Amino acid sequence: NATEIRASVGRMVGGIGRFYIQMCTELKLSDQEGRLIQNSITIERMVLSAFDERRNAGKDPKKTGGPIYRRRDGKWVRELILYDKEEIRRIWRQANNGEDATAGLTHMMIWHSNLNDATYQRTRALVRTGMDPRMCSLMQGSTLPRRSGAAGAAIKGVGTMVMELIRMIKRGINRNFWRTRIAYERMCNILKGKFQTAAQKAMMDQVRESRNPGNAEIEDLIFLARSALILRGSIAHKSCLPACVYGLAVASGYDFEREGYSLVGIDPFRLLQNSQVFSLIRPNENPAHKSQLVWMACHSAAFEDLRVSSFIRGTRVIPRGQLSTRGVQIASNENVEAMDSSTLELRSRYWAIRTSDMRTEIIRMMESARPQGRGVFELSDEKATNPIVPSFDMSNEGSYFFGDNAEEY
Amino acid sequence: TEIRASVGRMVGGIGRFYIQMCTELKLSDQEGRLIQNSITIERMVLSAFDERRNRKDPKKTGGPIYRRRDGKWVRELILYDKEEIRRIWRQANNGEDATAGLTHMMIWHSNLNDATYQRTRALVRTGMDPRMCSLMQGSTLPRRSGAAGAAIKGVGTMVMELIRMIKRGRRTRIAYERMCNILKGKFQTAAQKAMMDQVRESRNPGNAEIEDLIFLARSALILRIAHKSCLPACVYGLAVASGYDFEREGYSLVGIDPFRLLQNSQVFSLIRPNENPAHKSQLVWMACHSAAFEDLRVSSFIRGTRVIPRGQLSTRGVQIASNENVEAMDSSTLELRSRYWAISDMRTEIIRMMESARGVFELSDEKATNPIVPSFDMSNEGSYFFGDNAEEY
């Protein structure tokens, strides 16, 4: 539909906020405790593990949980929880009208992935697979589990698909290619669908079913990955919010079902405008930098040009190597009592809606190609009626990954 | 504290000089943290105080500068009057000839050359065996760095330059005299010291001294030099930019100061295609701790990650050649941190005593209070030069 799809997506996010409100009722988190992004990632992690049918030593397999952070005596304190995977399954179905609602689970998953894309470096994995560190710019979706289906695969960058393909060929060079090969060609046709020139499509045809793929196909997958540095694929960008934001909205009395919801329009921008989200800050960490990290993760903007990202946001989105923060998630061995909460700035000034024969053609179309965001509107402008003229500083570095110093995933 | 203030005033000088030539070349923050730009500025000031041995208009020096333009790196060649850079160097040291700061940058270039370049073809052309690569520290120093340069020169370096002058055959003999007593002072048994006395005390040096100087160079493979930790100018530069005062905080090349400064360093390097940025990181890491001749199991324990031999690295060196496409390359942070920090009768005696022969702390520790017990794996190779494939200097 146009709206029938908007009812389904609204029923899904509605589901996620209902699930969050009730698990905050049953973990006894105050309002402030419910608005901490750390608490919300733990509940997201628990409900994802509860429904991990494929993955279900001294650890109970019917139990899940994680770190929860609570206000006691004027400080934050790490309190660990354990919950039956069956009881979280029942609470999730209770909050979705008895439905499995796998689409809400993949939604939370896409949010985790985009958060990881904005936060963690993957250079070490890129080198050990034969790819260049420059291809960091194409590593969207690289952290997605293999249980995210088509939704997961739509947001995977050309680099992600090339990396998983190199690794599968790497493990076939070891004569163990019997019956696991339609899996190989489905991910080849998924990367095929991601290319946007008949030349790269044709080369991805040649890569598909060579009966015995090895280092010759690996070098083809590297040629087509550098090919996507100039002639870019078309990958989906799903704006997925942490559970605590749908949570607060459903608490507020916002009806996602009858109002509808789209990940592509202004809905995510509008909800983030009225967000109250908190984050634990490590000592010597800039809370605005942590805010840009979360902001860029909620709009899957880690691969977009920073000048386009700064225009939309109203404040400058600096490269990752110039941030004074590390991840959102707090490790088990960090002193939580040394840390304090800071409101995350997540608002935006504007919103938006944005040696072979096939090797000679691509080289030509790379030499040929000449190297901004024109779907940018004011948040008063509910319809896409009056686009806004972009204002960048062209001197500013385009890439989020220029001079990256981020910790490896 | 006086030597610690002196060394601190010298390093402080180097960071001031780097900040000033970055303000005057208009290099951005990121551009200033590129080790390639930093080697070019070091080379210019070294060449400006030379015209013989410090290492086309003769009154100008310069080199390649790498700038961010339109999302890529671009090689810009620069030229500067040798007097104008000399004046900036003196401005940054309170009008003093900071000769020690110039030697410092030199020892850094030398240790970098030791970690990067193979010398086996020079060794064979001089009559020495390639195994003696372990003793070629300081081999790329210019031929007048004085006592500071000569103190870090390995037994093999001194043997090679001594064989090399004898190969061509008072005016050029006091040079021979000092170099023999400098290599004599580097030995640590009366037998080879006495043997170096006889080679030094020789009317007509020839094939007999060359073979003697080879016997005592193999002697130094069993019966075994200064190690100066020198950082590139961009690291002192960033630290003095931070407001770190090296003079009243003091600085030693031997302690934890280099470890501590490297720990919070932000240094970038251009990576050639198909080069491992971690391998380039190990290359620079080993150059800043002059550890190209130290045992890799000692180097790996100290660093917390394995320091592999040079022949198994996937890099070719930091300096970028005239012919290489800079726009094809990208910058990567160099991992420079460390897990820990640290501190024929004579022929008969030597041969007998050769067949005979059978300080690591955490950075929390500040002072050497609680040593850590070293934990190696003997199967890991000990020499940086095992199966070396590096390009000849």
Side-chain angles (χ1 to χ4, degrees), chain A residues 1-174 177 180-353 355-369 371-409, chain B residues 1-169 171-202 204-357 359-393:
Chain A
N1 229 95
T3 68
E4 303 297 328
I5 191 67
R6 283 177 49 79
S8 65
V9 172
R11 189 163 308 97
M12 182 232 290
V13 287
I16 299 193
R18 266 176 281 121
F19 163 77
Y20 188 73
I21 295 180
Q22 185 196 0
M23 283 216 26
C24 281
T25 320
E26 206 184 326
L27 286 174
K28 301 320 303 139
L29 300 133
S30 78
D31 272 322
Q32 293 307 295
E33 289 176 336
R35 304 152 185 264
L36 180 77
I37 193 172
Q38 278 74 17
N39 292 346
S40 75
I41 199 167
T42 288
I43 295 164
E44 296 159 358
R45 298 283 278 185
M46 282 166 68
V47 61
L48 281 183
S49 284
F51 280 98
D52 202 1
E53 12 131 314
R54 276 253 93 183
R55 190 143 293 242
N56 317 324
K59 179 175 169 161
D60 191 346
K62 297 174 28 66
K63 297 274 207 185
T64 181
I68 290 296
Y69 302 89
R70 308 192 103 94
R71 282 299 278 189
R72 163 196 77 180
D73 272 7
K75 294 159 193 307
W76 289 106
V77 61
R78 177 194 300 95
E79 187 170 2
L80 300 189
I81 61 160
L82 267 188
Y83 260 70
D84 278 329
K85 298 216 198 146
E86 174 180 8
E87 211 66 22
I88 309 184
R89 274 193 263 103
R90 181 200 55 71
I91 293 167
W92 168 262
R93 280 181 192 113
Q94 185 274 354
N96 284 268
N97 302 85
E99 306 288 79
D100 289 345
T102 51
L105 300 173
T106 38
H107 188 76
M108 293 176 132
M109 206 189 286
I110 296 188
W111 143 244
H112 285 165
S113 186
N114 293 327
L115 185 59
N116 288 329
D117 292 317
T119 299
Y120 294 117
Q121 170 160 212
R122 287 283 268 165
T123 298
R124 303 314 194 181
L126 285 174
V127 172
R128 59 179 150 106
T129 59
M131 297 160 85
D132 319 344
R134 181 178 304 225
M135 285 173 208
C136 50
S137 183
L138 313 161
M139 291 315 292
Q140 153 131 3
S142 70
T143 305
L144 280 161
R146 20 179 157 160
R147 59 177 227 85
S148 314
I155 71 165
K156 291 197 161 160
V158 48
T160 301
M161 226 56 75
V162 171
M163 173 184 261
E164 299 176 359
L165 273 185
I166 298 193
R167 282 195 185 184
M168 208 207 316
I169 305 165
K170 213 89 166 192
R171 278 161 31 78
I173 300 192
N174 284 118
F177 264 14
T180 177
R181 156 159 244 308
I182 300 310
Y184 174 85
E185 60 192 339
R186 174 64 270 202
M187 56 190 85
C188 293
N189 277 354
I190 282 175
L191 182 60
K192 160 73 160 303
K194 284 168 186 310
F195 281 119
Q196 301 293 351
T197 77
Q200 302 166 338
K201 289 225 160 212
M203 196 175 307
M204 197 53 63
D205 285 340
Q206 182 76 23
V207 151
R208 202 184 9 154
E209 175 141 78
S210 294
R211 197 184 289 177
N212 286 287
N215 190 266
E217 301 308 320
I218 296 312
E219 179 54 56
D220 283 310
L221 266 312
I222 288 162
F223 178 87
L224 284 168
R226 300 161 170 163
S227 82
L229 292 171
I230 304 308
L231 296 320
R232 273 159 275 201
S234 195
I235 61 188
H237 299 153
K238 295 198 145 44
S239 280
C240 294
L241 293 321
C244 60
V245 164
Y246 310 121
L248 192 62
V250 176
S252 160
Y254 192 101
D255 189 338
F256 283 99
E257 206 166 315
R258 191 255 282 191
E259 292 294 295
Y261 195 88
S262 194
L263 291 80
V264 305
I266 189 180
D267 302 340
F269 281 94
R270 195 228 293 202
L271 205 44
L272 282 177
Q273 205 70 10
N274 297 323
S275 59
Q276 210 178 9
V277 187
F278 299 103
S279 179
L280 301 171
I281 316 295
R282 291 176 191 94
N284 301 110
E285 284 203 325
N286 187 337
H289 290 182
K290 185 145 288 186
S291 288
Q292 179 204 286
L293 181 48
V294 174
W295 176 92
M296 182 168 20
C298 311
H299 291 113
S300 177
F303 301 89
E304 191 65 84
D305 191 297
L306 301 171
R307 298 166 289 184
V308 164
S309 292
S310 302
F311 182 57
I312 292 172
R313 178 193 197 202
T315 164
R316 199 192 141 204
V317 173
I318 79 189
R320 179 159 73 190
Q322 292 176 229
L323 289 167
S324 298
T325 176
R326 293 202 285 95
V328 167
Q329 197 144 1
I330 298 300
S332 60
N333 62 268
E334 318 201 37
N335 184 26
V336 187
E337 287 176 50
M339 305 187 302
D340 205 335
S341 165
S342 176
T343 301
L344 292 180
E345 182 29 86
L346 291 184
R347 296 190 296 279
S348 289
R349 162 108 185 93
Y350 303 118
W351 68 275
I353 44 73
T355 173
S356 190
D357 291 42
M358 316 132 152
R359 278 197 196 214
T360 308
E361 190 187 352
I362 284 152
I363 292 153
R364 192 260 302 181
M365 293 168 75
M366 298 194 285
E367 160 265 339
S368 68
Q372 92 296 299
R374 67 173 92 248
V376 193
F377 312 90
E378 306 249 27
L379 66 102
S380 73
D381 196 18
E382 180 188 323
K383 311 141 284 202
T385 59
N386 307 311
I388 301 286
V389 181
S391 185
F392 321 127
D393 178 10
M394 195 89 159
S395 275
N396 291 31
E397 284 291 349
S399 182
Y400 185 46
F401 310 93
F402 176 58
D404 199 359
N405 52 33
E407 30 167 328
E408 183 73 19
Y409 180 70
Chain B
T1 196
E2 213 280 299
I3 224 31
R4 205 192 152 84
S6 161
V7 170
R9 188 164 55 257
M10 184 227 74
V11 153
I14 299 192
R16 267 181 287 269
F17 161 76
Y18 189 75
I19 295 183
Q20 182 56 252
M21 286 226 75
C22 277
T23 319
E24 206 162 340
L25 285 173
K26 302 213 146 293
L27 295 152
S28 83
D29 271 330
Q30 276 39 62
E31 287 175 346
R33 303 168 156 98
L34 181 78
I35 193 175
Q36 280 72 18
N37 288 347
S38 169
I39 292 186
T40 289
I41 293 164
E42 299 157 356
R43 287 186 99 269
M44 283 172 49
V45 64
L46 280 182
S47 165
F49 281 96
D50 193 12
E51 257 244 290
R52 290 194 194 165
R53 296 181 179 175
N54 232 258
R55 273 260 181 78
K56 46 191 166 49
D57 192 346
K59 305 194 204 301
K60 291 181 179 295
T61 180
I65 292 294
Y66 303 93
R67 301 187 175 268
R68 283 301 278 191
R69 289 294 176 284
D70 277 349
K72 295 169 175 304
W73 289 109
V74 297
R75 170 205 301 276
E76 179 185 328
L77 207 85
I78 67 160
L79 280 178
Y80 259 71
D81 283 3
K82 296 211 195 160
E83 83 165 340
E84 236 264 276
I85 172 162
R86 276 194 290 274
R87 172 177 70 72
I88 296 167
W89 169 258
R90 278 183 190 112
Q91 183 182 343
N93 283 273
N94 295 39
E96 309 310 327
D97 291 347
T99 307
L102 297 171
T103 311
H104 188 79
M105 291 180 294
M106 269 195 39
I107 296 190
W108 147 240
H109 288 162
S110 188
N111 293 328
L112 181 61
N113 287 334
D114 294 317
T116 296
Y117 294 115
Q118 172 170 208
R119 288 284 265 164
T120 47
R121 291 142 64 167
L123 271 284
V124 66
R125 198 192 318 107
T126 324
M128 297 145 80
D129 41 306
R131 179 177 285 204
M132 280 163 37
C133 51
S134 280
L135 317 166
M136 292 316 293
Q137 172 167 270
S139 67
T140 55
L141 282 164
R143 293 181 182 174
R144 186 168 177 181
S145 185
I152 67 108
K153 292 197 167 145
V155 181
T157 303
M158 298 304 298
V159 170
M160 176 185 260
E161 55 189 28
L162 272 183
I163 294 176
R164 187 167 285 188
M165 59 202 313
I166 305 169
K167 213 89 155 180
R168 55 171 45 231
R171 39 181 37 83
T172 320
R173 197 228 199 279
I174 305 310
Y176 179 87
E177 287 284 314
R178 288 195 298 274
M179 282 187 278
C180 291
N181 281 136
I182 284 278
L183 179 62
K184 159 227 167 186
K186 283 167 186 309
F187 283 120
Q188 303 292 352
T189 78
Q192 41 205 10
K193 307 212 63 150
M195 201 171 317
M196 285 235 57
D197 281 336
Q198 177 68 275
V199 65
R200 165 188 74 173
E201 180 282 333
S202 280
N204 276 45
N207 186 38
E209 290 84 314
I210 299 174
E211 294 162 347
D212 273 45
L213 282 165
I214 290 162
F215 282 121
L216 46 82
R218 207 173 293 99
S219 86
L221 293 171
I222 304 311
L223 300 169
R224 285 262 277 173
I225 318 293
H227 297 108
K228 294 277 178 277
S229 282
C230 295
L231 307 182
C234 58
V235 172
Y236 310 131
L238 195 153
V240 174
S242 298
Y244 192 99
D245 190 42
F246 281 96
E247 206 180 318
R248 292 288 82 235
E249 217 67 54
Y251 194 90
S252 191
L253 307 185
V254 166
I256 192 184
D257 309 335
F259 280 92
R260 194 222 65 84
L261 200 59
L262 284 176
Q263 205 70 13
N264 291 102
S265 285
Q266 264 95 54
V267 185
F268 300 100
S269 179
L270 294 179
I271 312 298
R272 293 176 189 99
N274 301 111
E275 294 198 323
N276 189 331
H279 289 184
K280 188 87 72 195
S281 293
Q282 176 205 308
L283 184 278
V284 173
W285 184 88
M286 283 182 30
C288 309
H289 290 114
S290 175
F293 303 88
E294 313 290 357
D295 192 294
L296 303 172
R297 302 165 294 228
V298 169
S299 290
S300 301
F301 187 57
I302 289 171
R303 180 196 197 200
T305 67
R306 195 173 138 241
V307 171
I308 78 189
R310 180 158 72 191
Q312 296 170 62
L313 288 168
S314 168
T315 176
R316 244 197 35 176
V318 281
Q319 285 192 70
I320 299 301
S322 334
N323 311 317
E324 319 187 17
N325 186 225
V326 189
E327 296 235 39
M329 305 179 311
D330 198 331
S331 58
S332 73
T333 301
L334 294 185
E335 182 30 86
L336 288 184
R337 301 186 309 94
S338 292
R339 183 192 227 199
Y340 305 118
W341 68 277
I343 322 158
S344 196
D345 196 1
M346 303 313 187
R347 296 255 268 94
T348 302
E349 256 300 335
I350 285 198
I351 57 94
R352 199 273 157 276
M353 58 167 76
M354 299 190 287
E355 57 185 13
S356 147
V360 190
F361 318 90
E362 300 185 22
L363 271 84
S364 73
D365 208 9
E366 306 160 280
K367 196 260 193 306
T369 300
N370 203 315
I372 304 284
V373 61
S375 318
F376 327 110
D377 292 70
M378 292 304 295
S379 310
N380 273 334
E381 282 283 339
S383 181
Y384 185 45
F385 312 92
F386 179 54
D388 199 7
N389 53 33
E391 8 157 26
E392 195 90 5
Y393 181 71

